[PDB]
């Protein structure tokens, strides 16, 4: 129906999703600046569930964008995008839990020392999957 019409919302959705991944990394990095308690156990134990919660939240955000698109319409193109997300989503969740635990173990000051490597590594893996998705979408549109 509309060229620039459909393009504006679709473009917005892709940008937000990439931002969302960055946002997940941002929440933990932001948290370290301000410390309070650290008994080794509770701290690390609390973090593992928190990471799981963040991944679930990202999935929810994607669902919200799709529902909005349907509402605007009146008063596959979507199937492929979903598939890419699933592959990346599975890898990111595994990476976040495994990377965080490993980072803490190698050093002594799991606090800041664990956070710098754990945060950077998780973001890189998710980005790589996302990059693959971007190339596929561009090729389709010609």
């Amino acid at each position: 129906h509309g060229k620039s019409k459909l393009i504006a919302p679709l473009a917005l959705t892709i940008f937000v999703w990439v931002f969302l991944m960055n946002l997940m990394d941002l929440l933990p990095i932001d948290l370290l600046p301000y410390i309070a308690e650290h008994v080794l156990g509770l701290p690390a134990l609390r973090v593992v569930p928190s990471a799981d919660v963040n991944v679930t939240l990202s999935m929810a955000l994607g669902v919200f964008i799709l529902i909005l698109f349907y509402s605007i319409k009146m008063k596959s193109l979507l199937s492929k995008p979903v598939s890419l997300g699933l592959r990346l989503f599975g890898n990111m969740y595994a990476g976040e839990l495994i990377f965080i635990l490993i980072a803490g173990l190698l050093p002594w000051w799991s606090q800041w020392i664990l956070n710098v490597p754990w945060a950077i590594f998780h973001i890189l893996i998710i980005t790589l999957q996302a990059f693959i998705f971007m190339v596929l979408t561009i090729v389709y549109l010609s």
Partner: protein, 79 residues
């Protein structure tokens, strides 16, 4: 013990995930191919092909993917 433990454990993730992951990928290719022929041969389920291709694929990968998350969750984590 601890030696063959950590070694067997890791190797487990690799043998398990690579073996089940491979089994997964292959099947998607196997069943996906055959399925496609059928689901596509049908009247107008061509779109069904892809729509279910993504779901059938992810569900096949979800296995080792689950073993990885669940595995490392108590493996690499709890050690």
């Amino acid at each position: 013990m601890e030696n063959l433990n950590m070694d067997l454990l890791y190797m487990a993730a690799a043998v398990m995930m690579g073996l089940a992951a491979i089994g997964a990928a292959i099947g998607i290719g196997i069943l996906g191919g055959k399925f496609l022929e059928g689901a596509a041969r049908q009247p107008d389920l061509i779109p069904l092909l892809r729509t279910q291709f993504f779901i059938v694929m992810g569900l096949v990968d979800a296995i080792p993917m689950i073993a990885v998350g669940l595995g490392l969750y108590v493996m690499f984590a709890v050690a």
